[PDB]
């Protein structure tokens, strides 16, 4: 187990480590999170009380470097660092530690949650879409624009998501206009899957982070890339059927996550009526329909 | 965006464009079969392109063997119709190239633009007119040559004969979609108003009758009394 200590909480704050949140007082005595579980990315974010805009957040994992957070009261805003120093690292920690002033990551042992959500997320292409050589861990906010977002304007602080646009040179063969427009197979399968991301599981890992910067951030262009890959999926004829099972179970557990009331802003009517009722795959998200039917049949 | 009244002059300004009318694409006779069942038989049908401004009509004729063995065919024929829009794009020299497509109908929005990704600046728009293009089949010559044809064919009208030589293409245009409304709501009684007087007759290169300026004031009037008249047979008044 891993450790985020935290040399002081100068303003007060909610923080969030993954799907879990607690709120730190103004100069209350906490010094970070212990118990971090190995082998998952993970997400530190932060919302402070005394201005909601900008949630914005970490990206890290423990097997990569010790990171630590130190408020900088200039740009006012919790920081990630690393730490090289690895002896000075665990005395801090110690030192926190028995004092017992950090929480505990608070994992249930039944709980699968966090690795349902990341199932497919690695760190290495999460540093790919957020680019910032010279960091292990990946900054990203509510206001982050998408690559795709842009060209429709910093680029240095950009979300670099791979551009799915289905009305494009891209997705459509010449000469196959009709084919290609209505069964999106060759775009999914040649362009994208063979293509691009080489494979399911990076598809899949690029799909699994959108949503989560959608949700723990209200990054809105994050949600437009989840749900338009969700929908290239749904809109192809053709997917290989072990494809189709995991997304099944990838967007139950996206689903089961979301908070109740934030359904209206991070769910995309259109895209889910179609992906469900009148889609190509409408039959092969059994899971994810009767949750979907059951926990948001207003959407529907 | 989407044409309208409030820009209605646009259409004969001096940028190149085209209406697209697709609906007399895809033409079916619907009757019973030996069994009691109902089938269709499909008729040869065209492609409306028409220049608002100088009149020039691209008529696609649409034979049936292009439907033969082919499933969803209403879905087809407006990919069909986008193909051969682009395919006529295409062959012409650059300068004659469309700046923008007006289609009709909205459903031909996503076919158009699929089929002219590789013109990106050429601006594919709906309209809030509602055109009534779809009697182009009223029009003797060009029904007669659409169900003639034998095999696909492309047969290039002028659809406003001489008119321009002596009216504005606002005007022409005006003119046009008023006969073909006519043509559209009562087109028996449109006919017998066009032919009515044997010593007005329609020249072998033009579409519609040799009238005086009088004599289309008279024609117009008389097109208007019918529309008005159909207006008031169909809701009591
Ligand atoms: N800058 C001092 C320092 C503090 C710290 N902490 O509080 O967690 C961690 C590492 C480090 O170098």
Redesign the pocket.
Known sequence: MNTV????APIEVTIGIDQYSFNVKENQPF??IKDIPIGHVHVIHFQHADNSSMRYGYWFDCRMG?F???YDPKDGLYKM?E?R?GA??EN??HN?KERQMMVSYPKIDEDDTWYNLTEFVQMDKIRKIVRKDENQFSYVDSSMTTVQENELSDPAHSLNYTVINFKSREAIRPGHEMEDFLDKSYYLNTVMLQGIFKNSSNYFGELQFAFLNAMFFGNYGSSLQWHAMIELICSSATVPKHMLDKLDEILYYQIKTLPEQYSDILLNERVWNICLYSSFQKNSLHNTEKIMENKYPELL | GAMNSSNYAELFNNDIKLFVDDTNVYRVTVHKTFEGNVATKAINGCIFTLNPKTGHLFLKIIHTSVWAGQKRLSQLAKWKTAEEVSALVRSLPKEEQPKQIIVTRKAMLDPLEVHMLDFPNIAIRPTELRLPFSAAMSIDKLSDVVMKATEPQMVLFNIYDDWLDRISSYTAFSRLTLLLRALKTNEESAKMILLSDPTITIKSYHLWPSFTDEQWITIESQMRDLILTEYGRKYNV
């Open positions: 200590p935290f040399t002081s010094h970070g010790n630590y957070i130190q660092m730490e120093d000075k690292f801090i920690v926190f």
